[PDB]
């Protein structure tokens, strides 16, 4: 039972580590994506204002 | 990269009926059926989303070097899309490395085979 | 001796699992820092391209 539970604990906690790593990368990606969305929005608005002034 | 793709797809096309309702096949016919379905799902691409040469090279390298075998059939388009997103973000240096030496006679250089197989392994372990 | 090595392997495997989980979180943090850094950089490059095509 010690052998079996050692294997189970190792695999389960490695899986938990992988899952929390997935959460870390996911939240970092979400922050990067929303910041990128803001950047693209302001760039598009700058382009539109410049287009109005060019007209 | 594409010779193995073309050959495997041709073999799968030859093996048509067996895939779809012959159930008494070994894992020699069925292996080709599986791999051909993998490659065919790989070619399914949306509209207005072209892939540069290094992207297709990386995806077909992953598919033809057995790195995609464990992926189930319906999820392969998402696997390709996720691997590309990982490749844009997690490792742009490997994309640059592929694109710089796409013209050499022996493309799978050890510098390229490394850092591409490494990226594939990283994506496989991190995701699913 | 079977029980002794099994117990020692249980705690040692937990320890090595924590070492590898530390490596996993380090790799995930490196990936997150990277991914966000060039996501912001690509947002900057896209804004620059938008300005260039506007001009």
Curated annotation (Swiss-Prot), chains A, C:
Species per Swiss-Prot/TrEMBL record: Chloroflexus aurantiacus (strain ATCC 29366 / DSM 635 / J-10-fl)
Localisation per UniProt entry: Cell membrane
Subunit structure: F-type ATPases have 2 components, F(1) - the catalytic core - and F(0) - the membrane proton channel. F(1) has five subunits: alpha(3), beta(3), gamma(1), delta(1), epsilon(1). F(0) has four main subunits: a(1), b(2) and c(10-14). The alpha and beta chains form an alternating ring which encloses part of the gamma chain. F(1) is attached to F(0) by a central stalk formed by the gamma and epsilon chains, while a peripheral stalk is formed by the delta and b chains.
Family: Belongs to the ATPase B chain family.
Superkingdom field: Bacteria
Range of the intact protein held here: 56 to 110 of 164
Name of the molecule in the record: ATP synthase subunit b
Role, per record: F(1)F(0) ATP synthase produces ATP from ADP in the presence of a proton or sodium gradient. F-type ATPases consist of two structural domains, F(1) containing the extramembraneous catalytic core and F(0) containing the membrane proton channel, linked together by a central stalk and a peripheral stalk. During catalysis, ATP synthesis in the catalytic domain of F(1) is coupled via a rotary mechanism of the central stalk subunits to proton translocation. Component of the F(0) channel, it forms part of the peripheral stalk, linking F(1) to F(0).
Curated annotation (Swiss-Prot), chain B:
Subcellular location: Cell membrane
Disulfide bonds: none
Signal peptide annotation: none
Quaternary state and interactors: F-type ATPases have 2 components, CF(1) - the catalytic core - and CF(0) - the membrane proton channel. CF(1) has five subunits: alpha(3), beta(3), gamma(1), delta(1), epsilon(1). CF(0) has four main subunits: a(1), b(1), b'(1) and c(9-12).
Protein family (similarity comment): Belongs to the ATPase alpha/beta chains family.
Function: Produces ATP from ADP in the presence of a proton gradient across the membrane. The alpha chain is a regulatory subunit.
Protein name stated in the entry: ATP synthase subunit alpha
Organism phylogeny: Bacteria, Bacillati, Chloroflexota, Chloroflexia, Chloroflexales
């Amino acid at each position: 039972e010690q052998l079996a539970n050692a294997r189970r604990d190792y695999e389960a906690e490695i899986a938990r580590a992988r899952q929390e790593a997935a959460k870390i990368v996911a939240q970092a990606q979400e922050r990067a994506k929303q910041q990128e969305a803001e950047i693209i929005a302001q760039a598009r608005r700058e382009a539109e204002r410049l287009k109005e002034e060019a007209r | 990269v594409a010779g193995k793709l073309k050959g495997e797809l041709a073999q799968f096309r030859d093996l048509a009926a067996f895939a779809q309702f012959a159930s008494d096949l070994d894992a020699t016919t069925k292996a080709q059926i599986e791999r051909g379905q993998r490659l065919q799902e790989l070619l399914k691409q949306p509209q207005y989303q072209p892939l540069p040469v290094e992207d297709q090279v990386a995806v077909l390298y992953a598919a033809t070097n057995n790195y995609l075998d464990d992926v189930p059939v319906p999820l392969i388009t998402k696997w390709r899309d996720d691997f590309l997103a990982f490749l844009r973000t997690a490792h742009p240096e490997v994309r640059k490395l592929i694109y710089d030496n796409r013209l050499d006679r022996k493309f799978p250089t050890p510098e390229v085979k490394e850092a591409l197989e490494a990226a594939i392994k990283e994506f496989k372990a991190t995701s699913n």
